[PDB]
Ligand binder design. Structure first.
Ligand SMILES: Nc1ncnc2c1ncn2[C@@H]1O[C@H](COP(=O)(O)O)[C@@H](O)[C@H]1O
Ligand SMILES: [Zn+2]
Ligand SMILES: [Zn+2]
Lengths: 931, 7
């Protein structure tokens, strides 16, 4: 048409561009794009429908389509003039796109148009939204972005699991092919901020106003001041983008000679460990207009909210520096004139450089606690060992403490043939039966411990959305508000069992008892006081487990040093005991399932939700994949009870000790030393409680992400819409805590999303109609959160949902639920897998079975576990309890028979029959505690 | 749409 063709060649300006319409005449083009909105009635970060634009794609010499677009738009005459005024002040910056203002008549009237030349198809908001809301069911935009910039080919996606981080670790390489674009965009944003400051222009910078070449447009919400006094607002631009900077490794060019990827690496000297000026240079180069103080060394931070802020920047900047400069800092001291080599400080990836306060170079004969501290340090062990190059693993290798490598194996189990024969003689283990054996003792070969250790390759450096985390931390703290803690003295500490290992090297000379006897109460107090001014690094040892299981992978635990454990108990036990003594809360550590406990827990979690459904989910590789920023945060929440007993400096040094002891320390695997990249160490003194804090944190962040990614123009209830508007302000517009809104959001969560938590196991009761409308979290929100904040893919085949509350959760702590009738009232009881019970009967470690008459209490305990199976509709399940009763009777008869034949001792059957009658076992599940 | 001072 004459109109359409004249419009086309007028859009073609004085440039030489061969344009082709995008399926339109003179009319607009409608798309579906991600926006960051805040306009006094709607707020959030979500996908809306874009309506008023005409798009023309550009061709090249060979008549092929290229990634360049002219995007024209019609609007009102007052916006035209304002945007033209603002542009002429900014037109000379190289980071601004080229604009063209003209007037064209679509009818008898003339309307104004603004054309932007040579944009890309997507913006910086589309990429961030794609990576923070991942769903492999529909990921068209991410795939298009990856192929249009030569990160991969289009047939790369025909592989299945191409996105999984654990299967197919190669996807990381693909994502690292975007880093340079992100770095270029950052540099252009700094240029644009400088230009805005000089011109005298005030406005907020959003991700959807920058394209993937780094240019800026859309000056409609800006205003003008006097030159030299412009102020750009950059709070939600940087915070929403932070998680993507570590996933693409955007700062990899900084380790080359001139920040050029075609040149060799920088060669630092090996003795350098400071890098404090490099960190300030990096901050001033990429984050110039972020207006909050940054401390390269977190020992200068003001409160614990400050530490999180600065450690987040440290996590990113530490990826540029050599890995041999991190860890303990040592020097030479003299005792009686002989020289040692001892640790006097530490260089943390997240916290910077820390120096010990009480170090003395010249001293006479040293004392008992000084000997303990010097034997615990890895300095003298590593200094006098051999150099090691271990090619079996990709972790960092330090030294070999001896001249041979050790290869430890795992043995098979012992067969209890009598119980198996008795079971076979009663009709068990037939063909086609629904009960069969699938729990065994699996054996392992020589190179099994090192293979298991190499699973720390799944721990990656992760940067968080800092403004989002600072709100979630305040909400998580409301859950831990009915307890009390603080420090205790050495004579108030409770230790369950003193005949367990003390770790390396203390396990050369005795158990833990030996060390709690030799140290007096005033020696332990002095050691505790020493760790509030100094850092003591220790060595953790790796142990292979020998137990029954259903899958054939070796399991390992961490044995931590006695020096760490002794002081952590004095710091944390008062709080840990207080959580375990409480009933009716969210964390249910300490509650027993017997005497009506299971029923009480279920009734408490049902609470009064309105359209209730039940839900449970899964954490892949939970302890090997936990980011370091969330373990730090978990430690800071437990230490908030120390407001009167400890100073700010004391609290900082306790945090530093914890990090150097159980977060990234030396591990002894075999007889060699390795460096741990991160993750949790299952075996430290606060494991289950820290896991609880972490679990609650992830749930809260999934709810926050659910609510803000919802189109607020479609929320019918005006109360829930006002709540969405206030969440955005408290994240990205407010700098201090707002205690009235933290209470309000916390109550809202306790009415519609009710949790039961036990040290990363969980059950949730949630309002089903709110979740369908996006007002409450679902399984898809958890999957998205774990992808960008945990570096794993969660398959929804390990998650369950239940729509009927008369059936209790599908699984909790390996138990099932059933609603039975017990004396006029219905109650919920737990029961196990029958395979687990029968396997415990059949396979054991010698002596412990294969002769039942030596230990009949084992079978009484197993029968207590198996009792509730008598209530099951399936008949093969109740036979398990009856089989155990009959075998107990048989063992008692056989034992009393032996004593009379070969010896003449005659035993009596007084109050023993109670063990093969069901009344003893029924009373364990009835609501009245005994003993 | 992202404004400085909506009210
Ligand atoms: N309440 C709203 N007010 C204005 N624009 C909105 C609103 N909700 C969604 N949008 C979308 O955001 C675009 C404007 O982006 P912003 O930049 O001005 C609009 O053209 C819509 O596609
Ligand atoms: Zn700070
Ligand atoms: Zn304290």
């Amino acid at each position: 048409s004459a109109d359409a063709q004249s419009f086309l060649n007028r859009v073609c300006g004085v440039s030489a561009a061969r344009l082709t319409p995008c399926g339109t005449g003179t009319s607009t083009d409608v798309v579906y794009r991600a926006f960051d909105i805040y306009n006094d009635k709607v707020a959030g970060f979500a996908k809306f429908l874009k309506t008023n634009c005409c798009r023309f794609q550009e061709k090249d010499e060979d008549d092929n389509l290229i990634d360049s677009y002219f995007v024209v738009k019609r609007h009102t005459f007052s916006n035209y003039q304002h945007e033209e005024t603002i542009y002429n002040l900014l037109k000379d910056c190289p980071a601004v796109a080229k604009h063209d203002f003209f007037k064209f008549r679509i009818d008898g009237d003339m309307v104004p148009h603004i054309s932007r030349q040579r944009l890309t198809k997507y913006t910086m908001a589309d990429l961030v939204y794609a990576l923070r809301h991942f769903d492999e069911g529909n990921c068209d935009t991410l795939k298009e972005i990856l192929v249009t910039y030569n990160c991969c080919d289009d047939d790369y996606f025909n592989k299945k699991d191409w996105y999984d981080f654990v299967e197919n670790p190669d996807i990381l390489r693909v994502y690292a092919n975007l880093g340079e674009r992100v770095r270029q965009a950052l540099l252009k944003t700094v240029q644009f901020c400088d230009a805005m400051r000089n011109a005298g222009i005030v406005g907020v910078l959003t991700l959807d106003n920058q394209d993937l070449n780094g240019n800026w447009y859309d000056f409609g919400d800006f205003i003008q001041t006097t030159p030299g006094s412009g102020v750009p607002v950059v709070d939600s631009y940087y915070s929403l983008l932070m998680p993507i900077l570590t996933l693409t490794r955007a700062l990899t060019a900084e380790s080359h000679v001139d920040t050029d990827l075609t040149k060799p690496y920088i060669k630092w000297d090996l003795l350098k460990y400071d890098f404090t000026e490099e960190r300030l240079k990096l901050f001033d180069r990429y984050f110039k207009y972020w207006d909050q103080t940054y401390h390269p060394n977190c020992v200068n931070c003001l409160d614990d909210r400050c530490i999180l802020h600065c450690a987040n920047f440290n996590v990113l900047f530490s990826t540029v520096f050599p890995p041999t400069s991190f860890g303990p800092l040592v020097r030479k001291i003299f005792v009686d004139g002989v020289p040692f080599v001892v640790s006097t400080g530490y260089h943390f990836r997240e916290l910077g450089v820390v120096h010990n306060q009480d170090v003395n170079l010249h001293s006479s004969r040293l004392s008992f606690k000084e000997l303990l501290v010097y034997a615990a340090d890895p300095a003298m062990h590593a200094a006098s060992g051999n150099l090691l190059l271990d090619k079996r693993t990709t972790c960092f290798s330090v030294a070999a403490l001896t001249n041979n490598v050790a290869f430890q194996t795992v043995k098979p189990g012992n067969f209890n043939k009598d119980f198996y024969d008795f079971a076979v003689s009663k009709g068990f283990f037939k063909e086609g039966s629904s009960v069969e054996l699938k729990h065994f003792f699996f054996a392992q070969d020589g190179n099994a411990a090192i293979s298991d250790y190499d699973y720390y390759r799944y721990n990656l450096p992760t940067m968080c959305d800092i403004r989002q985390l600072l709100f979630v931390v305040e909400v998580v703290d409301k859950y831990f508000d009915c307890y009390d803690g603080g420090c205790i003295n050495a004579n108030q500490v409770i230790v369950n069992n003193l005949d367990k290992s003390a770790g390396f090297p203390f396990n050369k000379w005795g158990k833990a008892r030996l060390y709690y006897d030799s140290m007096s109460y005033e020696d332990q107090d002095a050691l505790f006081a020493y760790t509030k001014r100094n850092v003591i690094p220790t060595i953790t040892q790796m142990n292979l487990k020998y137990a029954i299981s259903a899958k054939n992978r070796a399991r390992t635990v961490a044995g931590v040093s006695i020096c760490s454990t002794m002081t952590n108990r004095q710091f944390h036990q008062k709080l840990l005991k207080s959580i375990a003594a409480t009933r009716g809360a969210t964390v249910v550590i300490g509650t027993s399932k017997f005497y009506g406990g299971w029923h009480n827990m279920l009734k408490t979690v049902y609470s009064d939700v309105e359209n209730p459904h039940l839900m449970g989910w899964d954490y892949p590789k939970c302890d090997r994949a936990m980011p370091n920023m969330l373990r730090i945060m978990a430690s800071l929440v437990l230490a908030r009870k120390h407001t009167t007993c400890c100073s700010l400096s004391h609290r900082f040094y306790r945090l530093a000790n914890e990090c150097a002891q159980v977060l990234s320390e030396m591990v002894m695997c075999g007889g060699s030393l390795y460096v741990k990249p991160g993750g949790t160490s299952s075996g430290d003194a606060t494991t289950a409680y820290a896991n609880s804090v972490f679990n609650i944190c992830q749930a809260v962040t999934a709810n926050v992400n659910a609510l803000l990614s919802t189109d607020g123009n479609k929320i019918a209830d005006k109360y829930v819409r006002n709540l969405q508007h206030r969440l955005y302000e408290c994240l990205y517009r407010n700098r201090d805590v707002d205690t009235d809104f933290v209470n309000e959001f916390y109550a809202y969560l306790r009415k519609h999303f009710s949790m039961m938590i036990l040290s990363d196991d969980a059950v949730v009761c949630f309002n089903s109609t709110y979740a369908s409308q996006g007002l409450v979290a679902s399984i898809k929100n958890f999957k998205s959160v774990l992808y960008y904040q945990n570096n794993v893919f969660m398959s929804e085949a390990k998650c369950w949902t239940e729509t009927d509350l008369t059936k209790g959760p599908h699984e909790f702590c390996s138990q099932h639920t059933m609603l039975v009738k017990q004396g006029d009232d219905y109650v919920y009881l737990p029961y196990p897998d029958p395979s687990r019970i029968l396997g415990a009967g059949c396979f054991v470690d010698d002596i412990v079975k294969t002769d039942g008459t030596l230990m009949i209490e084992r079978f009484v305990s197993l029968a207590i576990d198996a009792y509730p199976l008598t209530k099951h509709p399936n008949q093969e399940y109740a036979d398990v309890f009856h089989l155990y009763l009959q075998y107990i009777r048989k063992l008692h008869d056989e034992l009393t028979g032996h004593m009379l034949d070969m010896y003449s001792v005659m035993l009596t059957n007084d109050n023993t029959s109670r063990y093969w009658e069901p009344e003893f076992y029924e009373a364990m599940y009835t609501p009245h505690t005994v003993l | 749409n992202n404004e400085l001072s909506p009210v």
